[PDB]
Amino acid sequence: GSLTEDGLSYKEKFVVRSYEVGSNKTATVETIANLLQEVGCNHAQSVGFATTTTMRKLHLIWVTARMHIEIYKYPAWGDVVEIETWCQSEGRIGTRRDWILKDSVTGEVTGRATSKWVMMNQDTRRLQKVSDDVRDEYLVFCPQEPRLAFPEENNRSLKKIPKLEDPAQYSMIGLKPRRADLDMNQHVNNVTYIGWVLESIPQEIVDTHELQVITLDYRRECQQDDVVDSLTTTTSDSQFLHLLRLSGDGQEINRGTTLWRKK
Amino acid sequence: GSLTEDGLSYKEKFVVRSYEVGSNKTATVETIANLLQEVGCNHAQSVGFSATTTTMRKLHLIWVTARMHIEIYKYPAWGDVVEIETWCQSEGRIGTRRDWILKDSVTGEVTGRATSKWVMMNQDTRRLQKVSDDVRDEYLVFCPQEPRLAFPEENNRSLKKIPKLEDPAQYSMIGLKPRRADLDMNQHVNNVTYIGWVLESIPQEIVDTHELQVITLDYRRECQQDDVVDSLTTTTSNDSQFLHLLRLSGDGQEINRGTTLWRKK
Numbered sequence: 001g002s003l004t005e006d007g008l009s010y011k012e013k014f015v016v017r018s019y020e021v022g023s024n025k026t027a028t029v030e031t032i033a034n035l036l037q038e039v040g041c042n043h044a045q046s047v048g049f050a051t052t053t054t055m056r057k058l059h060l061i062w063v064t065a066r067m068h069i070e071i072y073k074y075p076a077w078g079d080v081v082e083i084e085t086w087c088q089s090e091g092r093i094g095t096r097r098d099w100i101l102k103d104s105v106t107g108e109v110t111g112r113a114t115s116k117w118v119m120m121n122q123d124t125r126r127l128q129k130v131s132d133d134v135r136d137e138y139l140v141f142c143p144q145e146p147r148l149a150f151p152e153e154n155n156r157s158l159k160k161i162p163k164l165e166d167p168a169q170y171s172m173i174g175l176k177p178r179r180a181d182l183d184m185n186q187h188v189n190n191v192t193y194i195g196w197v198l199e200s201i202p203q204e205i206v207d208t209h210e211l212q213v214i215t216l217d218y219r220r221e222c223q224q225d226d227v228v229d230s231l232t233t234t235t236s237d238s239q240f241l242h243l244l245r246l247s248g249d250g251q252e253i254n255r256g257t258t259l260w261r262k263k
Numbered sequence: 264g265s266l267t268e269d270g271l272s273y274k275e276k277f278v279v280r281s282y283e284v285g286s287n288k289t290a291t292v293e294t295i296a297n298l299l300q301e302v303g304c305n306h307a308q309s310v311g312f313s314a315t316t317t318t319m320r321k322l323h324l325i326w327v328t329a330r331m332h333i334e335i336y337k338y339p340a341w342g343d344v345v346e347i348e349t350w351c352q353s354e355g356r357i358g359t360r361r362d363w364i365l366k367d368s369v370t371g372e373v374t375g376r377a378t379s380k381w382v383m384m385n386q387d388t389r390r391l392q393k394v395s396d397d398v399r400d401e402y403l404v405f406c407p408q409e410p411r412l413a414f415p416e417e418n419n420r421s422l423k424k425i426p427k428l429e430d431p432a433q434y435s436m437i438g439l440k441p442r443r444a445d446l447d448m449n450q451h452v453n454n455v456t457y458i459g460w461v462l463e464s465i466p467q468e469i470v471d472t473h474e475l476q477v478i479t480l481d482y483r484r485e486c487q488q489d490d491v492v493d494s495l496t497t498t499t500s501n502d503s504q505f506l507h508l509l510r511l512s513g514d515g516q517e518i519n520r521g522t523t524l525w526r527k528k
């Protein structure tokens with residue numbers, strides 16, 4: 001993996017591994033979400049970072065507020081997939097990171113993703129909103145002109161997700177993260193929430209459908225010693241509404257929507 | 264990745280990924296166990312397997328894991344390159360054995376090694392059977408004729424008998440269920456998930472102040488997609504030793520048993 005010629009985006013090629021594929025012999029959406037996380041990690045490292053020099057002083061971190069992923073074709077075990085990523089400023093609101101998944105052999109676009117990131121104090125978890133001085137540090141690594149993975153005005157990535165009302169049509173209760181679900185800072189990985197959201201999807205839907213779109217909002221972090229409840233309701237191609245909440249009190253940690261197509 | 268010059272072993276280099284490391288900034292034992300599984304899958308594919316042969320597919324016979332022993336000297340950090348060399352070996356009518364050697368790509372030193380025992384079984388009836396002569400001829404051409412052991416030692420800890428954990432267990436992790444990410448392409452619980460479940464009962468205090476050096480894990484029964492597991496641990500000892508037991512939360516049917524060894528940082 002390396003940065004592109006202009007240095008305003010990073011590219012990396014991945015070979016799909018045996019343990020990374022599902023029952024349909026193609027890579028899972030969690031494997032794709034892991035490769036997006038990995039390519040973004042190396043892009044940050046290649047430009048010296050995704051905390052900055054100013055951020056580390058005031059205990060500031062970049063957190064995920066929304067993840068939208070659209071897949072056209074899932075790479076089979078053995079295939080090579082090239083992902084191009086890049087960050088972009090969104091004023092005082094935060095930072096946006098986009099991805100383009102391509103076939104290494106044909107060069108066609110087989111998927112695309114977009115994520116909204118917000119500024120937060122690691123210790124108090126307060127929003128704070130992107131401040132002066134710290135914005136100019138990373139603006140130099142972003143294309144000055146708009147480069148959107150989802151350019152279409154008023155599209156799926158910018159839609160408002162409603163809260164699932166009870167009773168949910170489907171549910172997966174008592175979901176706890178393990179040590180493999182935690183990262184280097186002992187926090188639950190952002191991809192585990194995606195796997196938890198799809199646990200409430202009925203097995204029959206999975207077996208007769210392919211996941212085309214997934215939009216997932218991040219409201220609260222699930223701790224290592226927390227238990228999650230996954231809820232789903234058909235709102236329709238098949239569309240579903242999702243809700244992740246704490247098993248006890250019922251505090252909302254995530255909400256989202258998925259879209260599936262017939263095979 | 265490619266086979267070696269003689270074609271009696273396969274080599275593959277992996278770069279350690281960000282999501283593959285633990286709290287120590289180094290790759291986890293589950294990441295290592297995944298790379299061992301992946302290098303073995305490509306070695307089988309490079310010599311025309313799927314790891315079933317022509318005769319095994321015809322009789323509905325599969326290769327199952329009966330034991331996995333892994334010893335790590337150094338865990339590769341995020342960014343480091345690790346070269347793994349694997350090879351299969353015939354163990355007569357008992358079954359086959361597969362070994363691994365983990366090396367540093369920069370220095371070339373051995374940073375870990377693994378060994379696994381595999382047994383012949385009927386895919387449908389789940390009944391174990393002895394390896395027939397006609398099957399043994401089909402895979403022996405891809406194995407070194409002379410013994411090549413990753414753990415050659417006179418008294419190595421890979422061939423030791425593991426006892427059954429008696430109740431009450433010192434530590435426990437109750438209500439463990441596999442998810443879709445824990446299943447493979449045939450909807451079976453991945454062999455690495457059992458390792459992660461075994462280490463869930465290890466206290467967080469031990470993990471934070473120790474590094475996992477050895478892990479021996481016996482496979483007795485497969486955990487279904489709709490099954491719930493209970494993980495049990497008891498200290499049996501600078502070095503810390505533990506006894507482990509995975510069983511169904513309900514009836515208490517044993518699915519796994521093993522031992523781990525940890526050293527002080």
Ligand SMILES: Nc1ccccc1CO
Binds near residue numbers: 066191
């Ligand atoms: N942001 C985000 C959210 C979910 C999954 C993966 C990523 C990449 O970091």
Ligand SMILES: Nc1ccccc1CO
Binds near residue numbers: 297454
């Ligand atoms: N054999 C075995 C056992 C446990 C984990 C991984 C492997 C490799 O397939």
